[PDB]
Amino acid sequence: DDNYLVYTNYDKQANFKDFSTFYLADKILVISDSKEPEYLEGEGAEQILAAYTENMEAKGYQPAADKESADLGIQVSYIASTYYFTGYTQPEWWWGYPGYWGPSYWGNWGGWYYPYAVTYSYSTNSFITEMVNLKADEGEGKKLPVVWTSYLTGFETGSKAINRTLAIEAVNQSFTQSPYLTNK
Template sequence: MTVKTIHFLAIALLAAAVSSCQKDPSTSALHREYLVYTDRDRTADFAAFETFYLPDSILIIGNNKQTEYWKDADALEIVGTVAFELEAAGFLRISEKQNADLGVQLSYVERETYFVGSNNPYWWWYYPYYWSPGYWGDWMGWFYPYRVYYGYTAGSLLLEMMDLKATRVEGKRLPVVWDSFMSGLLTSNASLNQERTLQAVEQAFAQSPYLYE
């Protein structure tokens, strides 16, 4: 599948979300296909963000009851590609999490299927070792300020960007200002899986020009 095809699928999915009479259009028919989907908080001013913090590991969501992080050379290449794209968009990567404007996290769905919807945004509560809100500070949790409904299955990569400088008031949650869902990354060839994953990350940024403005 070409990058143009991936982009077309993403546009078609967004069009369906706008035109459908459903309040929360389902992407379940596509979550096993090679697809790159992105969404954003349309009230966010990305030009106001200058720095970001990105961990050097990827959380693995699977069947293991212990916390697992993907940290090998392939994982570092994926993290490096995300960092490169963010820096190309004008953001500066820093090592002090508490001083960053944006928090960026990557998660890889290894085996199981997970869902997230605007009717139940705290989908990660079903997975006890997901990046906890406390990792990003004294927030009660976080949320998507836009309508979203995803189905994740094996081979999906999740990329989320949180506004760490949002005004903190009692009961307020940390907003996710941009996210990407990349699926259909698994084949029988490990090197091809890595290539598809890197292409998907690049495509996620290519179809998000507002990050570069």
Template sequence: MTVKTIHYLAIALLAAAVCSCQKDPSTSSLHRDYLVYTDHDTKTDFAAFETFYVPDSILIIGDNKQTLYWKDEKAQEIVATVVAKMQNAGFTRTEDKAAANLGMQLSYVERETYFVGYNNPYWWWYYPYYWTPGYWGDWLGWHYPYRVYYGYTAGSLLIEMLDLQAPQTEGKRLPVVWDTFIGGLLTSNESLNQQRTIEAIEQAFAQSPYLK
């Protein structure tokens, strides 16, 4: 073995020794971040929609069997953010639900965890919440034209966009053409929670450029 070869080997061994002494990257800081998941029906032409309707309150999903709504100033700020982002995308808000092309429904998971499978997308089937399919019209259930399977944990916000002008074929299933799941919003600081929620909604629309 030549001196030159020994020199290169020594450098390689030194590098390996340094790397072996380094700790693996810590993932403990990931809890400080929130998750923004979005999905949509790739066959939907969002440019074909003009108007949307959104309730003035947020549905609360928890362990209470009674219908609960979130209506305070923070809820209104969240709804207003959704409205603003929809308007920025070129849609017009209407107060006439029957005349709207799209329906926007917001849900906040307060405590429990729900799992959604695309085979049974009507995930609050056993809860008397006010935006059942009948809230939007003569519909029997939901239909996601794309695969949906994830969990909802405490502190999650869900926004679903419904196609209200879909043909009323046999079965009358109401298609959900876009949705977002926002998780990891809860901290010990209520003001920070609200700030993260607003930022996450803005991110959901930012990563959905097809909503035009």
């Protein structure tokens, strides 16, 4: 079947009916071989972010006015280089990129909390997406928990595949294989 691979992992204790609204970070972080965070520009990135938006709405979640009022946050990253991951050891290897999303982008949290295992092999031309619980306690030393992660990878590079919107099809697939991710 598909010209890509989609892996999803999630918090089995999370109650996806707890949440009503989400805020999607409105730019896709490029993980590059330099420390300064840069983002994808242009139509493609806009279409990928629109696919997250549409999918969350289909599952019952409304876009929030802002981060402070949202129940759930989503952050999306494109891996263009694995320079920072060589010799990784942490299962969440993306944390090794100096420019990676910080908890403090979202609110008063000082680190991440992963309530489930991830076993993804790093590769470029791939996406890491994390969904965070913004209702979690804030304050000094408090950690921002993730409720869902996806890894979109293994994308074919021949012209027929490039000319299909494969990233969007992979985003759609990540929701299809996450039947629990709904408040309905």
